[PDB]
């Protein structure tokens, strides 16, 4: 279908790799980038991990493991395992060498790579970071801040940071009104202050605005669904505006459409193409929502899977989104560079937006305007 503003792909079917569907869940099958999928496979105490290398032909490396949780680095051949709440060990798979080894003061509830350099930890009470590649094997993670009370009684599902590693957001969900509500702790390290807000998804990104040259402004992108009314909302807002810059970002608020009877749905991931200024917002039930970043305008709504999504990641040099569904398909979406401008011009009937997107991305389709 040649009008679609996106390309939709299956990167791999995990089930065709002999992997069991019993481990397709958020804790057991981890997905930090579209480079690797790590599956924790439980069979008695004869426990194991299957590492799928998406770059190298879906090659699986399988190892016995004594840990309860395992993640791969976004790019490097580095695996992180934790056990018994508090025991953490990180290895260079290639040399077999141990990068980090320590025992934490409090059990880890959630972890993920915040960047290529920094691993984030959330405990019952605390939020911690580790500069894993400092060459100090036994150096323990540094306290970032205590958890805000708004995250009490939630399941921790995300921890994100900006590139500068001085703004952060932790996301927890809980059942309210028989539906999923989300709570976010936002933390500014420079101010040493936290703020509690409502939401299910969060990401820090950057945008180049006319008249600021080649200097980005930073924006936070967050999406919520109200657990009582069902109303969905995306917000985009500036953080730490650099004063010399003459263009700044005016906050945007845009609807996220959920069918009223989509009782159990909520936003489950958000990823941004900084190059193209495109937000990808994915829901648990498999709905994809595209937004343009400058204007917050909704571009597209559709569904890419009928099976629920349980984990997601950036795709293709962070210009798209990838996800894994309950049937074990790894699915991917990114804009079609050749079709997105005609789509905006002619389907959305929106000349000004088409020119915004064409200009930012160097894309075709606006050359007869």
């Amino acid at each position: 279908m040649s009008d679609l503003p996106i390309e939709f792909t299956e990167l791999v079917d995990l089930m065709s790799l002999g992997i069991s569907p019993q481990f397709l869940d958020f804790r057991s099958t981890t997905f930090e980038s579209d480079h690797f999928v790590t599956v924790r496979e439980t069979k008695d105490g004869t426990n194991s991990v299957a590492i799928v290398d998406l770059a190298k032909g879906n090659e699986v490396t399988r190892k016995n493991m004594g840990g309860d949780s395992a993640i791969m680095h976004p790019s490097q051949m580095v695996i992180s395992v934790r056990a018994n709440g508090t025991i953490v060990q990180i290895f260079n798979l290639e040399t077999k060498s141990k990068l980090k080894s320590f025992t934490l003061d409090e059990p880890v509830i959630f972890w993920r790579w915040l960047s290529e350099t920094t691993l984030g930890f959330v405990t019952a009470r605390s939020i911690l970071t580790s500069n894993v590649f400092d060459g100090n094997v036994n150096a323990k993670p540094q306290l970032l801040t205590l958890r805000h009370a708004n995250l009490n009684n939630t399941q921790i599902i995300n921890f994100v940071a900006n590139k500068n590693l001085d703004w952060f957001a932790v996301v927890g969900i809980l059942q309210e009104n028989g539906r999923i509500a989300g709570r976010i702790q936002l933390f500014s390290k420079q101010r040493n202050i936290s703020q509690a807000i409502d939401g299910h998804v969060a990401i820090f990104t950057n945008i180049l605005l006319e008249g600021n040259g080649s200097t980005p402004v930073q924006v936070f992108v967050t999406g919520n669904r109200n657990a009582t009314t069902g109303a969905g909302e995306l917000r985009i807002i500036e953080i730490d505006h650099d004063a010399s810059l003459p263009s700044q970002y005016q906050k945007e608020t845009t609807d996220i459409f959920f069918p009223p009877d989509a009782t159990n749905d909520f936003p489950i991931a958000v990823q941004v193409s900084e190059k193209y200024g495109i937000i990808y917002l994915l829901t648990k039930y498999g709905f994809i929502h595209l937004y343009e970043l400058e204007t917050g305008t909704n571009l597209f709504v559709n569904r890419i899977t009928a099976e629920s999504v349980f984990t997601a990641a950036p795709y293709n040099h962070e210009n798209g989104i990838a996800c894994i569904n309950k049937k074990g398909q790894v699915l991917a979406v990114e804009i079609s560079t050749s079709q997105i401008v005609p789509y905006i011009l002619n389907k959305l009937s929106n000349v000004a937006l088409a020119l915004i997107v064409a200009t930012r991305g160097g894309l075709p389709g606006a050359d007869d305007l």
């Binding site: 936002l186 202050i193 703020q195 936070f220 967050t222 500036e238």
Partner: peptide, 6 residues
């Protein structure tokens, strides 16, 4: 504390 308007 109100860091930002959300």
């Amino acid at each position: 504390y109100t860091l930002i308007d959300l």
